[PDB]
Design a protein around this nucleic acid. Sequence first.
RNA 1: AUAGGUUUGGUCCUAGCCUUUCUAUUAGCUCUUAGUAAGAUUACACAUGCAAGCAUCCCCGUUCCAGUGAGUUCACCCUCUAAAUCA
Length: 215
Amino acid sequence: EDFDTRILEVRNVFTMTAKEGRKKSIRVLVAVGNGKGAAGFSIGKATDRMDAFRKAKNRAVHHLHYIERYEDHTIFHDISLRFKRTHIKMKKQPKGYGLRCHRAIITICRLIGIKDMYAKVSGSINMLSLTQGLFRGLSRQETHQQLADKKGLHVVEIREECGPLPIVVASPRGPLRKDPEPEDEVPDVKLDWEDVKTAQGMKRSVWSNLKRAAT
RNA sequence: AUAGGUUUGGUCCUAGCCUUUCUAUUAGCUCUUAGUAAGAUUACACAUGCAAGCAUCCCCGUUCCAGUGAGUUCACCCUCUAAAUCA
Ligand SMILES: [K+]
Ligand SMILES: [K+]
Ligand SMILES: [K+]
Ligand SMILES: [K+]
Ligand SMILES: [Mg+2]
């Protein structure tokens, strides 16, 4: 009773049979989630649409991921991934930002319990790949605690709204290293041109930052 | 772009086209009030009226303002140095 189901896609797939010719089947993608991190998805197939809905709904609950939510409202860090030909680039956002993402990601996020996030889907906009990719990235996100333990260092959060106050969000449960992490003068990191282009005010889009209903 | 529709018996990939947003002109139909802003398609031809005077005569001004977008890297910086203002 805690879990809620929401349809993502309904497709009329067809095969050819010797006796009848075109045989119509229903392929249904559904996502189930209780809103507290536990969410899954499944594909249900049946000649009747009701049977397809049921099969997908009941099978999705046996394939539940657990999503680590930072402060139970957003992701811990920005996740960029490619699943097959679909690119999903998700950004961590502050409280009150909303779900500025593809309608399907909005639906899945509400089931997971993420309230604030931005995501841009590029490449193929296949619904199967998007869902499978979204759950792949969110499942693999590293929490602040896991980072502190791996690095043996404090994770200190700097917030602009709190000035210079150092907020320690995670500390290493084991021994704390005494050597500071080597500060590379120039980071050899791969930058997304779309990010850099926006930061330099070089991106004019009439469709970006349009006023939309509360999500 | 938070995207959407569309190739096929069907699936996936790629791809073009189109949809949704925001402005400006024109057309159809329709139209109550007030304030404000803006306002020939045409460097085609133009009836008529007006748009430059001032002032003890000399001078000064009419080389400005206003208009248009035909032509088109004459517009910017540096160097140098006329005219002009500082009786
Ligand atoms: K397309
Ligand atoms: K009209
Ligand atoms: K005079
Ligand atoms: K011109
Ligand atoms: Mg001189």
